[model samples]
Target: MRQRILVVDDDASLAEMLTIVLRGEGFDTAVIGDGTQALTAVRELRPDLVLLDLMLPGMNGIDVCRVLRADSGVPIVMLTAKTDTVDVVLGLESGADDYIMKPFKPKELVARVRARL
Candidate 1:
């Protein structure tokens, strides 16, 4: 079966673009807009990997990462507009295995996700 990737982001367009790109790269994709719904999606989908945005509604990405990390060893990549080194480090500390900044191309995002997986 194709690896299922769960993408959690507020921007539907970005998630859609990621879904297309990931599908082309041979992975199944699911997209969710609300952070509060992300954990539910994770539980229901049991995705192979999670592509999460840091600035999400309800549960901020860091908190989400922390919570998920407490339970599973699932790989997580944090997508953020916060380019500062401190923020990136904090994200890493929060449990993300990788970090990708905003204004990134779909290819780059896919590459990061694939790399983590």
Candidate 2:
């Protein structure tokens, strides 16, 4: 069966690009724009992997990641373009399996996601 990936990002443009490429790569994709709708999407989608954005409304990403890690064994890969190393580290510390920076190469992005899957 085709695997599903849930993308957690408030950034519409980035999410769109991710969805486009992910679908073409033979995976199904779903998106949640913020924490307010995150759990519903996760529970409903039950994705094989999670493609999470590091920044979001009220810094919701980290908290959401914590909650997911507390129970689900699903792997998470954080996305960001921040210059701060701390930002990346914090994302990883939040229980993400790995992270991909913003404006990622298509091959690199798919490779990382596939690796996690």
Candidate 3:
């Protein structure tokens, strides 16, 4: 089966672009723009991996990561505009399996996702 990737980001444009790119790469993809809805979406969808954003409305990425970690072992790769070393560490500590700095090239992101899978 194709790996399913759930994209959690508030940026509609970015999310749409990612969906297109991921689909072209042959991964099944889904998108949800609300941080508050992300966890429930993941639980129900049970995607193979998650492309999660750091900044969000409702719940922040760090909190989302912690909650997801508590329940599931699904790999999470954070996509964040925050590149501060401390922020990156905090993201990883929050239970993200890996991370990508925002304004990332789609090819690089795809490669990283494949690596995690």
Highest lDDT scorer:
3
Per-candidate local distance difference test:
0.85, 0.83, 0.88
lDDT of 1 by residue, 1-117 (tens): 889999989999988888888999999999988778877888889999998888888888888888888768899998888553336567689888998889798887888888899
Where model 1 places Cα greater than 4 Å from the true spot, the runs are 83-86
- Per-residue accuracy of model 3 over 42-69 as CA lDDT, tens digit each: 8899999998888777887888888888
TM-score for candidate 3, residues paired by index:
0.93
Task: Give one digit per residue, the lDDT tens place, for model 2 in 5-114.
Answer: 99989889888988999999999999888866666677788899988877777546677788778768789998877653447677678788999878789889999999
lDDT of 1: 0.85
- lDDT score of residue 85 within candidate 1: 36
**For each candidate, C-alpha RMSD in Å?**
1.9, 1.7, 1.7
Q: Please report the TM-score between candidate 2 and the true structure.
A: 0.90
Q: How close is every model to the real structure, measured as TM-score?
A: 0.91, 0.90, 0.93
Backbone clashes for every candidate come to 0, 0, 0
- Candidate 3 global lDDT: 0.88
Error of 3 at 15 (Å): 0.5
Ranking by lDDT: 3, 1, 2
In model 3, the runs with Cα more than 4 Å from the true position are 82-86
